[PDB]
Amino acid sequence: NSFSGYLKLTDNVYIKNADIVEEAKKVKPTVVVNAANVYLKHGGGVAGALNKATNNAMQVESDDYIATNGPLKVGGSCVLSGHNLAKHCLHVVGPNVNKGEDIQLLKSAYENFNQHEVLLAPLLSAGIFGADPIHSLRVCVDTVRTNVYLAVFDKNLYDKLVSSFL
Numbered sequence: 001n002s003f004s005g006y007l008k009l010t011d012n013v014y015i016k017n018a019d020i021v022e023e024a025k026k027v028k029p030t031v032v033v034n035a036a037n038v039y040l041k042h043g044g045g046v047a048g049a050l051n052k053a054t055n056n057a058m059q060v061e062s063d064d065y066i067a068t069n070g071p072l073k074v075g076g077s078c079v080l081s082g083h084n085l086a087k088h089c090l091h092v093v094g095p096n097v098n099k100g101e102d103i104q105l106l107k108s109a110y111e112n113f114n115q116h117e118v119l120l121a122p123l124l125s126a127g128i129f130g131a132d133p134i135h136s137l138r139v140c141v142d143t144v145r146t147n148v149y150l151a152v153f154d155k156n157l158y159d160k161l162v163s164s165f166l
């Protein structure tokens, strides 16, 4: 949990312009959050990047989880191994608003972070999920009460978030 170069947004939310995969390799946090889907198929975005950094070990493990437990629900989560990136990976499903999934579920997705004291995480429902990233940061700030270190890869997006926030 040796986080460096973050800007403190609120008492418990920090932000950095960084690749979450590289942050995970440097820090080796207790928990890294994955922006997952209900079947834990890590095909792109943060999910594909995190899976790729474990050389597909996260996917093989996720397939076994789904066969034994069934899919997650939108707004839900599960804890699996963090492999070489972290002690644990908290897979969290935010709503895919481009597929008509309710934005009210973005609050439920962020509530999952509260079961862990410190997390390294991406913004939820950003990218292909289609939610407004600045709105996603507002829900995170209103909902998360534990210590969250947000990593945002795209510098144009990071700059828009920091500008809107401070």
Ligand SMILES: O=C(O)C1=C(c2ccc3ncsc3c2)CCC1
Pocket: 018, 019, 020, 021, 045, 046, 049, 122, 123, 126, 127, 128, 151, 152, 153, 154, 157
């Ligand atoms: O820039 C980001 O914060 C965002 C994404 C992303 C995509 C690929 C990727 N590979 C390594 S870190 C990473 C983040 C998807 C949407 C938001």
